[PDB]
Each structure stands twice: as structure tokens, then as C-alpha cells.
Amino acid sequence: TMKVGGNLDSKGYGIATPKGSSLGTPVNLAVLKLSEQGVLDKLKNKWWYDKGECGAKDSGSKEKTSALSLSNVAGVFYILVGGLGLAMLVALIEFCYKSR
């Protein structure tokens, strides 16, 4: 399962308290101080980006090949077999030209 599209909004999260709770100002000051300390992105690495343990981290760009296969080029055989059908049909109709 996959992200498609993108953000509809410049919205975000915040810490929240009862209205007028004394925690709001120390919370907000700590939130500011954390930003220049760079904690928030390192928490985000720890909870999303390091946990990108699936091969989808890499599988879309890896080197070399498992060799090429018929199904990738099989249509080339169709135009041949159709040419051989035409090579029969031409004789099948030129019979009536020689029959003239």
C-alpha cells in the first residue's frame, strides 16, 4: 500500500493542554529549543526513516539484470509468424493469377 497524491494543506500537529493550563508556555519554549537542537528530525528518522527496512528502500534502483526473457520481446515473434502467414497467403492467392 502506497502514497498517491500529496498534501492538501500546510497543516501540522501540536502539543495541546487544557485552555489556560500552565504547561503551554514551557511546552512552547521547549518546542522552540528542540528545533535548533535538531531533535525532531532525529526522532523522525528513528520512527520512520531508519525503520524503512523493506527492500523497497533499494529494489527500485539495483544494478545488473537476471538476463532477458522471451516475454519482454515476444511481440517480435508475432510479426514474424504473421509474415509467414502472409508468405502462405500470397501463394494461396497467386494460384488464381496463374490459373488465369
Binding site: 538476463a67 526473457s69 516475454s71 509468424v81
Partner: protein, 192 residues
């Protein structure tokens, strides 16, 4: 051109040999070694799979030889709207081209039998060679669709009854060559 006198025997036996191999290939319930299921749901996760042309079956499963005739199956996450995929599924439900090849090779039998019954009215004896080439094309398209479907690495292995699908093509074209080596003189003997 050589052995001018015996070629009617050699061609009729070669044609009957090709027909025998063709109908053994079409009739055999196994062609190759693969991984899959014994039945149209041995069926739980995977099994070593031993299917034929129209039949799905397995080898060294918890049961063996209880094969089944295949039936039409859907696809997941689109890409079925494409005519190539749709037609590939419609064919895979019942492969027309091998049995059409059987019918063409039988009609070649009738054409060579028409050497004697109402004997050789005009250059009709040419028709066997046309039928043998058309049988060749029907086999090769059958192989192409079969591989291009089932190979979708595969880690498969191919048995002799798979290779009989090819060998019946190789031999059908050798019988084509024999049928031309017949016609090219027989029609001259008819028409000067």
C-alpha cells in the same frame, strides 16, 4: 531428390508419425517441471508442479496423478483490459492452436489419401504442404503463448513431453519438405 519410388510410403509414415507425436503432446497430462499447485484449489502454499497443456497437475505432492483440466482465471490489479492479455487468457483457458494443428495434419492425411480417392484432381496434392506449414505455425504460436504465459527466474525445468511440442514442429516441417518433394513431381506427372 532421391528414392523417387518409395517417397509415398516415407511421406505417409512420416505424416502418421507426426500425427502420433502431436496427439501424444496434446494428450499428455504433463509437459514440464515447475512450482505451483496440484489442483485448482498441494493447494495450500506451493507444490512441485507437473502440468500438461490443458491440464494442471503436480509431482511429488501429497498426492500424484489427480490432475485437473484447466479453467479460466481472473487477474489482480488491472492490466486485463489489454487485448494481448485478454486474448492470452482466452487462449490459455483452452489452447486452440495445437488442436487446430492436429486438425490440419489430419487434413493433410486426407489430402495424401486424395492421391487415391478420386485420384489427384488438379494440383490438390499441394494442399498437404500448406496444411503442414500452417500446423507448424499453429505449434510455434502455441509454444510462444504457452511460454509467455507460464514463464511469468522461473526456476522451472522442461520434460520430454514439453519438447515433443517442439519436435512435432520440427518433424511437421520435415513432412512438409517430403510433401513438397512429392507434389513437385506428382503434379508434373499429372499435368506434364
Amino acid at each position: 531428390l532421391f528414392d523417387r519410388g518409395v517417397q509415398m510410403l516415407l511421406t505417409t509414415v512420416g505424416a502418421f508419425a507426426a500425427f502420433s507425436l502431436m496427439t501424444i503432446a496434446v494428450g499428455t497430462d504433463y509437459w514440464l517441471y515447475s512450482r505451483g499447485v496440484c489442483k485448482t484449489k498441494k493447494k495450500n502454499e506451493e507444490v512441485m508442479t507437473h502440468s500438461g497443456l490443458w491440464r494442471t497437475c503436480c509431482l511429488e505432492g501429497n498426492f500424484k496423478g489427480l490432475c485437473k483440466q484447466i479453467d479460466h482465471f481472473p487477474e489482480d490489479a488491472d492490466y486485463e483490459a489489454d487485448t494481448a492479455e485478454y486474448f492470452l487468457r482466452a487462449v490459455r483457458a483452452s489452447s486452440i492452436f495445437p488442436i487446430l494443428s492436429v486438425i490440419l495434419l489430419f487434413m493433410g492425411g486426407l489430402c495424401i489419401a486424395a492421391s487415391e480417392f478420386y485420384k489427384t484432381r488438379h494440383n490438390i496434392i499441394l494442399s498437404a504442404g500448406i496444411f503442414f506449414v500452417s500446423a507448424g505455425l499453429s505449434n510455434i504460436i502455441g509454444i510462444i503463448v504457452y511460454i509467455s504465459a507460464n514463464a511469468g527466474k522461473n526456476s522451472y525445468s522442461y520434460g520430454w513431453s514439453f519438447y515433443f511440442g517442439a519436435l512435432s514442429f520440427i518433424i511437421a516441417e520435415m513432412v512438409g519438405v517430403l510433401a513438397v518433394h512429392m507434389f513437385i513431381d506428382r503434379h508434373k506427372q499429372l499435368t506434364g
